[PDB]
Design a protein around this motif. Structure first.
Motif, PDB file in Angstrom:
ATOM      1  N   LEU A  11      -2.189  -4.741   2.129  1.00 21.95           N
ATOM      2  CA  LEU A  11      -3.372  -4.860   1.275  1.00 21.95           C
ATOM      3  C   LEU A  11      -4.327  -5.926   1.790  1.00 21.95           C
ATOM      4  CD1 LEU A  11      -1.861  -4.569  -2.308  1.00 21.95           C
ATOM      5  CD2 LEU A  11      -2.604  -2.770  -0.769  1.00 21.95           C
ATOM      6  N   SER A  14      -6.389  -3.976   4.238  1.00 19.76           N
ATOM      7  CA  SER A  14      -7.226  -2.937   3.637  1.00 19.76           C
ATOM      8  C   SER A  14      -8.364  -3.526   2.816  1.00 19.76           C
ATOM      9  CB  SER A  14      -6.379  -2.024   2.767  1.00 19.76           C
ATOM     10  OG  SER A  14      -5.496  -1.301   3.598  1.00 19.76           O
ATOM     11  N   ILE A  31     -10.540  -1.406  -3.777  1.00 20.39           N
ATOM     12  CA  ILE A  31     -10.271  -0.447  -2.720  1.00 20.39           C
ATOM     13  C   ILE A  31      -9.616   0.791  -3.314  1.00 20.39           C
ATOM     14  CG2 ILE A  31     -10.080  -2.178  -0.890  1.00 20.39           C
ATOM     15  CD1 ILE A  31      -7.014  -1.880  -1.024  1.00 20.39           C
ATOM     16  N   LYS A  32      -9.737   1.891  -2.587  1.00 16.95           N
ATOM     17  CA  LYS A  32      -8.952   3.078  -2.892  1.00 16.95           C
ATOM     18  C   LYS A  32      -7.488   2.834  -2.533  1.00 16.95           C
ATOM     19  CE  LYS A  32     -11.027   6.649  -0.951  1.00 16.95           C
ATOM     20  NZ  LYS A  32     -11.802   7.318   0.166  1.00 16.95           N
ATOM     21  N   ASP A  33      -6.589   3.233  -3.417  1.00 21.42           N
ATOM     22  CA  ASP A  33      -5.177   3.250  -3.067  1.00 21.42           C
ATOM     23  C   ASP A  33      -4.951   4.196  -1.888  1.00 21.42           C
ATOM     24  OD1 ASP A  33      -2.193   3.946  -3.297  1.00 21.42           O
ATOM     25  OD2 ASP A  33      -2.428   2.410  -4.835  1.00 21.42           O
ATOM     26  N   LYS A  37      -1.275   8.041  -6.543  1.00 24.99           N
ATOM     27  CA  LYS A  37      -0.305   8.789  -7.338  1.00 24.99           C
ATOM     28  C   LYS A  37      -0.971   9.632  -8.424  1.00 24.99           C
ATOM     29  CE  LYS A  37       2.888   6.749  -4.865  1.00 24.99           C
ATOM     30  NZ  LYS A  37       2.111   5.681  -4.154  1.00 24.99           N
ATOM     31  N   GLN A  41      -7.072   6.587  -8.121  1.00 28.71           N
ATOM     32  CA  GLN A  41      -6.317   5.344  -8.157  1.00 28.71           C
ATOM     33  C   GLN A  41      -7.021   4.318  -7.291  1.00 28.71           C
ATOM     34  OE1 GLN A  41      -2.154   5.499  -7.103  1.00 28.71           O
ATOM     35  NE2 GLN A  41      -1.737   3.464  -7.883  1.00 28.71           N
ATOM     36  N   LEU A  43      -7.279  -0.121  -6.557  1.00 28.81           N
ATOM     37  CA  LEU A  43      -6.705  -1.455  -6.662  1.00 28.81           C
ATOM     38  C   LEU A  43      -7.829  -2.482  -6.698  1.00 28.81           C
ATOM     39  CD1 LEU A  43      -3.876  -1.045  -4.019  1.00 28.81           C
ATOM     40  CD2 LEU A  43      -3.789  -0.573  -6.470  1.00 28.81           C
ATOM     41  N   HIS A  91       2.534  -3.468 -11.795  1.00 32.11           N
ATOM     42  CA  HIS A  91       3.968  -3.225 -11.732  1.00 32.11           C
ATOM     43  C   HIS A  91       4.731  -4.509 -12.008  1.00 32.11           C
ATOM     44  CE1 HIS A  91       3.457   0.619  -9.110  1.00 32.11           C
ATOM     45  NE2 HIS A  91       3.456   0.900 -10.400  1.00 32.11           N
ATOM     46  N   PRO A  94       6.168  -5.930  -7.991  1.00 35.42           N
ATOM     47  CA  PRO A  94       5.415  -5.242  -6.943  1.00 35.42           C
ATOM     48  C   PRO A  94       6.180  -5.242  -5.624  1.00 35.42           C
ATOM     49  CG  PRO A  94       4.595  -7.455  -7.172  1.00 35.42           C
ATOM     50  CD  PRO A  94       5.684  -7.300  -8.207  1.00 35.42           C
ATOM     51  N   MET A  96       3.905  -4.856  -2.573  1.00 34.32           N
ATOM     52  CA  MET A  96       2.880  -5.362  -1.674  1.00 34.32           C
ATOM     53  C   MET A  96       2.403  -6.737  -2.123  1.00 34.32           C
ATOM     54  SD  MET A  96       2.581  -2.916   0.512  1.00 34.32           S
ATOM     55  CE  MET A  96       1.050  -3.188   1.401  1.00 34.32           C
TER      56      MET A  96
HETATM   57  N1  LIG Z   1      -2.627  -0.348   3.145  1.00 31.57           N
HETATM   58  C1  LIG Z   1      -2.800  -0.001   1.861  1.00 31.57           C
HETATM   59  N2  LIG Z   1      -4.052   0.084   1.358  1.00 31.57           N
HETATM   60  C2  LIG Z   1      -4.208   0.441   0.075  1.00 31.57           C
HETATM   61  N3  LIG Z   1      -3.243   0.723  -0.811  1.00 31.57           N
HETATM   62  C3  LIG Z   1      -2.002   0.622  -0.276  1.00 31.57           C
HETATM   63  C4  LIG Z   1      -1.719   0.281   1.024  1.00 31.57           C
HETATM   64  N4  LIG Z   1      -0.346   0.273   1.213  1.00 31.57           N
HETATM   65  C5  LIG Z   1       0.163   0.619   0.042  1.00 31.57           C
HETATM   66  N5  LIG Z   1      -0.791   0.877  -0.871  1.00 31.57           N
HETATM   67  C6  LIG Z   1      -0.654   1.133  -2.300  1.00 31.57           C
HETATM   68  O1  LIG Z   1      -0.426  -0.141  -2.863  1.00 31.57           O
HETATM   69  C7  LIG Z   1       0.407  -0.037  -4.033  1.00 31.57           C
HETATM   70  C8  LIG Z   1       1.539  -1.020  -3.896  1.00 31.57           C
HETATM   71  O2  LIG Z   1       2.444  -0.906  -4.991  1.00 31.57           O
HETATM   72  P1  LIG Z   1       2.873  -2.180  -5.834  1.00 31.57           P
HETATM   73  O3  LIG Z   1       3.154  -3.246  -4.840  1.00 31.57           O
HETATM   74  O4  LIG Z   1       4.071  -1.682  -6.578  1.00 31.57           O
HETATM   75  O5  LIG Z   1       1.761  -2.442  -6.813  1.00 31.57           O
HETATM   76  C9  LIG Z   1       0.838   1.425  -4.130  1.00 31.57           C
HETATM   77  O6  LIG Z   1       0.090   2.080  -5.155  1.00 31.57           O
HETATM   78  C10 LIG Z   1       0.513   1.995  -2.736  1.00 31.57           C
HETATM   79  O7  LIG Z   1       0.182   3.363  -2.708  1.00 31.57           O
END
Ligand SMILES: Nc1ncnc2c1ncn2[C@@H]1O[C@H](COP(=O)(O)O)[C@@H](O)[C@H]1O
Ligand code: NA
Ligand SMILES: [Zn+2]
Length: 180
Positions: A11, A14, A31-33, A37, A41, A43, A91, A94, A96
């Motif tokens: 992240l 990104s 950013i776009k996820d 899912k 979606q 972030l 979450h 998490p 990430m």
């Molecule tokens: N490089 C990325 N850029 C954007 N979203 C990402 C990237 N890698 C993972 N994700 C998303 O980041 C979120 C990480 O999940 P969490 O850490 O549980 O909140 C998930 O919804 C992934 O689909």
DNA sequence: GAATCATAAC
């Protein structure tokens, strides 16, 4: 491999990529996820580095509220005429690094939703409402999570709209069509 | 056979 190149740091890369940014201000980026899912979606991330909600304190209360306001604005600007419902939240554990707010439509119509963990990470108490996190920081000064969060990811599949129990991800995906 | 599940990524 390297610390900077580790998968958990993705992240941080990104959030600096213009092709993935949909909104920027003095405090946050959206950013776009990468692996959405649902149909929508995003972030929301602060520019300032906060590793996770474990590092949040009352000095961040305004920022968490701003992340929420920005998430709601992105919904309006990009999906305002959708009839879709959205949730905003975090979450409980998490994967990430770098605190990030999920803004996710409630269709859950996406090929990247592949397993029970994905489903339950958004459709059990593992998904912490943004407002609940904000109010916990305000009243208690920090975010805490009770024991048992990993176990929620193994709960039987249950529809979030009508509470019907479904025996598989393919059958859940077919079921969800009725709620469009 | 289809789908789930835990395990592995050096
Ligand atoms: N490089 C990325 N850029 C954007 N979203 C990402 C990237 N890698 C993972 N994700 C998303 O980041 C979120 C990480 O999940 P969490 O850490 O549980 O909140 C998930 O919804 C992934 O689909
Ligand atoms: Na994880
Ligand atoms: Zn249902």
């Amino acid at each position: 491999g390297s610390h900077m190149g580790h998968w958990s740091q993705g992240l941080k890369i990104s959030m600096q990529d213009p092709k993935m940014q949909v909104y920027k201000d003095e405090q946050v980026v959206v950013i776009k996820d990468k692996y959405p899912k649902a149909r929508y979606q995003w972030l929301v991330l602060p520019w300032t580095s906060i590793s996770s909600l474990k590092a949040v304190a009352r000095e961040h209360l305004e920022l968490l509220k701003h992340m929420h306001t920005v998430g709601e604005k992105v919904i309006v600007d990009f999906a305002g005429s959708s009839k879709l419902r959205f949730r905003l939240g975090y979450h409980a554990i998490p994967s990430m690094s770098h605190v990030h707010l999920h803004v996710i439509s409630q269709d859950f119509d996406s090929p990247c939703l592949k397993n029970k963990k994905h489903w339950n990470s958004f459709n059990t108490e593992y998904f912490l409402e943004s407002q609940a996190v904000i109010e916990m920081v305000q009243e208690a000064g920090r975010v805490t999570v009770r024991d048992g969060m990993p176990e929620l990811l193994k709960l039987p599949l249950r529809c979030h709209e009508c509470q019907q129990l479904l025996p598989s991800i393919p059958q859940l995906k077919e079921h969800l069509r009725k709620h469009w």
